[PDB]
């Protein structure tokens, strides 16, 4: 069962998505999204992407969901059947999908998926004296000149836009 760790983490990810997507309350949705983001970062880390998972923790959770919950605290003043119904039925489709995957080791819904453990797709070689994802990200200042330019311009324009529309005049 330890070879299925990424699969189990993906199950927790989709279960948290069902939980927060039922919309019980905006703050509880934010809490469920935080938990789901943590589990997804765990998936990425177990796949080998340390830098991208730590970006998820630093920017998505520590930097942006803070803003979401901060805005949620400035509205939605503090103190159902639908929420419980959709949570129950989403859990039902999820566990039915898991049972159909693991019983026959193959499934088709829109694409064809295989029920074996996901350690099979990994590469048998070593990367030498560097990590491949860090070199790929580090090539942004040497190769991605145009990407840097358009992203920075969009960020500055976003600052200008937010300052423009919240003024009220």
């Amino acid at each position: 069962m330890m070879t299925y760790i990424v699969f189990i983490l993906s199950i927790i990810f989709v279960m948290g998505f069902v939980g927060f997507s039922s919309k019980p309350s905006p703050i509880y949705g934010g809490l469920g999204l935080i938990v789901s983001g943590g589990v997804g970062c765990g998936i990425v880390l177990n796949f080998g992407g340390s830098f991208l998972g730590l970006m998820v923790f630093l920017i998505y959770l520590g930097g942006m969901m803070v803003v979401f919950g901060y805005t949620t605290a400035m509205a939605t003043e503090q103190y159902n059947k639908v929420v419980l119904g959709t949570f129950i039925t989403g859990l039902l489709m999820e566990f039915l999908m898991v049972y159909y995957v693991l019983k026959d080791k193959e499934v088709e819904i829109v694409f064809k998926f295989n029920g074996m453990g996901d350690w099979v797709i990994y590469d048998t070689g070593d990367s030498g004296f560097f990590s491949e994802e860090a070199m790929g990200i580090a090539a942004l200042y040497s190769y991605g000149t145009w990407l840097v330019i358009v992203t920075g311009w969009s960020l500055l324009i976003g600052v200008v836009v937010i300052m423009e529309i919240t003024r009220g005049n």
Binding site: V150, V160, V161, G168, N169
Partner: protein
């Protein structure tokens, strides 16, 4: 709003459209789309009233949903092809998701519900910017991926857009909602002729852009947003009544005006591929667009509605608005049929 900040934001909108047009990478297409939408949001909220914020909220939600669907299609295509070159797609699911994302961005039916409300809630100049410039990039992306487009899906979207646009515009009295439903019908025509000859789509896009620009420019020149306020124009400037009469006749596709040429060439192209029922149905449906255009011309130019007393006070002053390019697009939208073979420059 600062003039310099307005200039920077408008060049950011055009920069996003250019980035979509010139790039060979799917991520750059996505980046250009978000840059364009983020920059165009403050143009909608120039006046700061609750209607503008409501329209901006609905526009933001629709464009964000369409953008997420587009990214989903791109990621599926990368998964099934291993590359990002903007060309034909290698998965029917990716093609369907991208086609519906571009349909949501264009506002074609049944994703049309945001267009009239958004056009109504924003000023005339921002509505002109939206309905004219915002549609250059999704049609370019559609122009790049036609080997992967499902024919049944795009033809269903086209006929649904034409019928829903005509039936929707039959009931409106506000000018911006009429322009929105007219836009929906014209995008139905454009994506109807897309898979047979995209040059006809480019020609229809250019002609619709010119006609819409002329009509919106006349609207802001006279500062009219309703039917009756437009009907007051005969007692202020009758030359504008003549101009709106000829432009609305040309918008209905009546020969020998320049609006006849797009549907004429579209019907010419569709019959070469042994499709006869659809061009007849689209012409019969475009008769409804002609109907509410003719109702507008009745209320404005061919009759004299009663005016009020203060029109004399308005007589004593001349206009000073910068009606930019208004005679040029007025001429180019009515007397361009003898230059029909000029469409070969677009191939």
């Amino acid at each position: 709003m600062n003039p310099i900040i307005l200039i920077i934001i408008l060049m950011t909108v055009m920069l996003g459209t250019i980035i979509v047009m010139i790039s060979t990478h799917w991520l750059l297409i996505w980046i250009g789309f978000e840059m364009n939408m983020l920059a165009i949001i403050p143009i909608m909220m120039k006046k700061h009233n609750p209607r503008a914020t409501e329209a901006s909220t609905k526009y933001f939600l629709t464009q964000s949903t369409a953008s997420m669907l587009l990214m989903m299609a791109i990621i599926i295509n990368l998964m099934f092809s291993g590359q990002w070159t903007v060309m034909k797609l290698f998965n029917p699911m990716a093609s369907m998701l991208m086609t519906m994302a571009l349909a949501m961005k264009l506002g074609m039916a049944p994703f049309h519900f945001w267009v009239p409300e958004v056009t109504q809630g924003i000023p005339l100049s921002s509505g002109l910017i939206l309905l004219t410039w915002q549609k250059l990039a999704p049609m370019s992306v559609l122009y790049q991926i036609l080997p992967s487009i499902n024919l049944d899906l795009i033809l269903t979207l086209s006929i649904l857009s034409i019928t829903i646009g005509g039936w929707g515009g039959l009931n409106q009295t506000q000018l911006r909602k009429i322009m929105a439903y007219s836009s929906i019908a014209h995008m139905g025509w454009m994506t109807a002729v897309l898979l047979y000859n995209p040059t006809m789509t480019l020609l229809n896009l250019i002609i619709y852009i010119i006609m819409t620009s002329t009509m919106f420019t006349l609207f802001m020149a006279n500062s009219t947003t309703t039917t009756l306020s437009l009907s007051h124009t005969w007692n202020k400037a009758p030359i504008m009544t003549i101009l709106v009469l000829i432009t609305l006749l040309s918008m209905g596709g009546l020969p020998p005006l320049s609006g006849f040429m797009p549907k004429w060439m579209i019907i010419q192209e569709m019959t070469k591929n042994d499709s006869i029922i659809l061009p007849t149905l689209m012409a019969i449906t475009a008769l409804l667009n002609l109907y509410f255009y003719m109702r507008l011309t009745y209320s404005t130019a061919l009759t004299m509605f009663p005016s009020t007393n203060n029109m004399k006070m308005k007589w004593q002053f001349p206009t000073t608005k910068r009606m930019t390019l208004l005679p040029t697009m007025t001429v180019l939208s009515t007397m361009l049929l003898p230059l029909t073979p000029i469409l070969s420059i677009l191939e």
